[PDB]
Amino acid sequence: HTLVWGVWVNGVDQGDGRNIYIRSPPNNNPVKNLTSPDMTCNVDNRVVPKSVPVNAGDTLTFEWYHNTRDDDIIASSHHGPIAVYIAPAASNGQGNVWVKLFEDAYNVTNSTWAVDRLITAHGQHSVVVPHVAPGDYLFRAEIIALHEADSLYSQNPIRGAQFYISCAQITINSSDDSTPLPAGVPFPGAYTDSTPGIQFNIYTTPATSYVAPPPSVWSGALGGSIAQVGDASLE
Ligand SMILES: *[C@@H]1O[C@H](CO)[C@@H](O)[C@H](O)[C@H]1NC(C)=O
Ligand SMILES: [Cu+2]
């Protein structure tokens, strides 16, 4: 159970983004229904009044929290991967538009899931803004908690993979559009019950065997990292 507070750009806090430049749902409940429109940008997908200005090569940092800013972030039980996608704002996230900028599942060296490292990073994970066409965009940050993913939601609706999905309105101003955005996947639609990484038993399968859901990260991406860039407690 986790939500996005706001973003940082190049290590600078852009301020509380909730219902402002983040298309915030009303609470931190997970999405589980792979076929639901809620898979696109969570349960209250509507235009919010601000869009954060960035330039290609900027570091865009999502900041997550559980109940209050810079708390325990997400329950330690919620082991799983983290991905970031991008689509043009004109789509409203509909169609084959979502391009993967970032993937992190399991780190064999540190023996830690993306979520484990997200807690250590005080909820902060980043992408580098790509050299796409100037204009308005949706950045879709997705945490998959796998603690009940031995079941499929489609089969047992009280279990299944849990999706914490947040869409940020981002305006890319300065960009040479040298890496124009290629074709995207649909949400809902990219993830199905047979998709690798959707049904997984983190209690019996080695984390080293985990494969995260496709698609693969775009070659045009520059992203990106799970790591604290700023200290919220200094404000
Ligand atoms: C899952 O979402 C689909 C598509 O909106 C919907 O038809 C179906 O009833 C949902 N399942 C549940 C259990 O609500
Ligand atoms: Cu939860």
Swiss-Prot record:
Biotech use, per record: Lignocellulose is the most abundant polymeric composite on Earth and is a recalcitrant but promising renewable substrate for industrial biotechnology applications. Together with cellobiose dehydrogenases (CDHs) an enzymatic system capable of oxidative cellulose cleavage is formed, which increases the efficiency of cellulases and put LPMOs at focus of biofuel research.
EC number(s) recorded for this UniProt protein: 1.14.99.56
Family statement: Belongs to the polysaccharide monooxygenase AA9 family.
Glycosylation (residues): N33, N110
Residues noted as binding (1,4-beta-D-glucosyl)n in the record, renumbered to the chain: V9, V47, V48, D58, N67, V129, R140
Gene Ontology biological process terms from the UniProt entry: cellulose catabolic process
Reaction(s) the record says it catalyses: [(1->4)-beta-D-glucosyl]n+m + reduced acceptor + O2 = 4-dehydro-beta-D-glucosyl-[(1->4)-beta-D-glucosyl]n-1 + [(1->4)-beta-D-glucosyl]m + acceptor + H2O
Binding site for Cu(2+): H1, H78, Y164
Localization, UniProt: Secreted
Cofactor detail note: Binds 1 copper ion per subunit.
GO cellular component: extracellular region
Binding site for O2: H147, Q162
Protein name: AA9 family lytic polysaccharide monooxygenase A
Activity regulation information from UniProt: The polyphenol cinnamtannin B1 contained in methanolic extract of Cinnamomum cassia (cinnamon) acts as an inhibitor of catalytic activity.
Segments forming a coiled coil: none
Modified residues (Methylhistidine): H1
One Pfam family it belongs to: AA9
EC class name: oxidoreductase
Organism in which the protein naturally occurs: Panus similis (Lentinoid fungus)
MF term (GO), any: monooxygenase activity
Keyword Membrane: no
Cofactor: Cu(2+)
Membrane-spanning ranges: none
